[PDB]
Design an enzyme around this catalytic site. Structure first.
Site, PDB file in Angstrom:
ATOM      1  N   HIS A 275       0.823  -1.205   0.000  1.00 12.28           N
ATOM      2  CA  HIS A 275       0.000   0.000   0.000  1.00 12.28           C
ATOM      3  C   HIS A 275       0.859   1.258   0.000  1.00 12.28           C
ATOM      4  O   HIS A 275       0.997   1.925   1.026  1.00 12.28           O
ATOM      5  CB  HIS A 275      -0.944   0.021   1.208  1.00 12.28           C
TER       6      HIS A 275
ATOM      7  N   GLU B  60       3.434   2.637   0.828  1.00 12.91           N
ATOM      8  CA  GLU B  60       4.608   2.554   1.698  1.00 12.91           C
ATOM      9  C   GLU B  60       5.557   1.433   1.264  1.00 12.91           C
ATOM     10  O   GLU B  60       6.658   1.695   0.771  1.00 12.91           O
ATOM     11  CB  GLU B  60       4.185   2.365   3.163  1.00 12.91           C
TER      12      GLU B  60
HETATM   13 ZN   LIG Z   1      -1.740  -0.036   4.430  1.00 13.42          ZN
END
Ligand SMILES: [Zn+2]
Length: 187
Positions: A60, A62
């Site tokens: 996600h 990151e």
């Molecule tokens: Zn996440």
């Protein structure tokens, strides 16, 4: 022509971390004490897994770019020039982990201009301060950097996207919080 536009980046949910999450990023491969890039891509897609074959937990934003790093498989003296544009600052484990890779070594400069996030205090502040303090330079990409978010990842630079008052609410939130979380000013 009929006035019909589709807003998926507006107040309407479109992130929630994993799952079909609208996210964008930009990473460069730093080498020879300098900065260089060997790819042609601006921003990111609204989902997990950049390529096909190989995906279980999902990335996600990151850990997404975080994956692009081992993707180049630099030697070691190199540096990670990663920049992210998400609709939220951190993530519980997605950020906690990210923060590590970045807090487990001094050679990763990041600029995550995130739209906004809303959390009580527990089960969220962990990845918040961690990734935001020892993970990257998290910016409050709300209504202001939002319009700019376009100016950076849009062919027209700032597409005709109308902003929602919620940006004023969220912006004020993500920002004021990000100050309290990182500064840890408990009051
Ligand atoms: Zn996440």
């Amino acid at each position: 022509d009929p006035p019909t536009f589709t807003f998926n980046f507006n107040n309407e949910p479109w992130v929630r971390g994993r799952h079909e999450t609208y996210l964008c990023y930009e990473v460069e491969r730093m080498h020879n004490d300098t900065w260089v890039k060997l790819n042609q891509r601006r921003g990111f897609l609204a989902n997990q897994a950049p390529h096909k074959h190989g995906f279980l937990e999902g990335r996600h934003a990151e850990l997404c770019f975080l994956d692009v790093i081992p993707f180049w498989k630099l030697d070691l003296d190199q540096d990670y020039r990663v920049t992210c544009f998400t609709s939220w600052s951190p993530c519980f484990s997605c950020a906690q982990e990210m923060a590590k890779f970045i807090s487990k070594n001094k050679h990763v400069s990041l600029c995550i201009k995130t739209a906004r996030i809303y959390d009580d205090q527990g089960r969220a502040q962990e990845g918040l301060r961690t990734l935001a303090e020892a993970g990257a330079k998290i910016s409050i990409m709300t209504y202001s950097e939002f319009k700019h978010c376009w100016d950076t990842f849009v062919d027209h630079q700032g597409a005709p996207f109308q902003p929602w008052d919620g940006l004023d609410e969220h912006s004020q939130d993500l920002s004021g919080r990000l100050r309290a979380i990182l500064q840890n000013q408990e009051n």
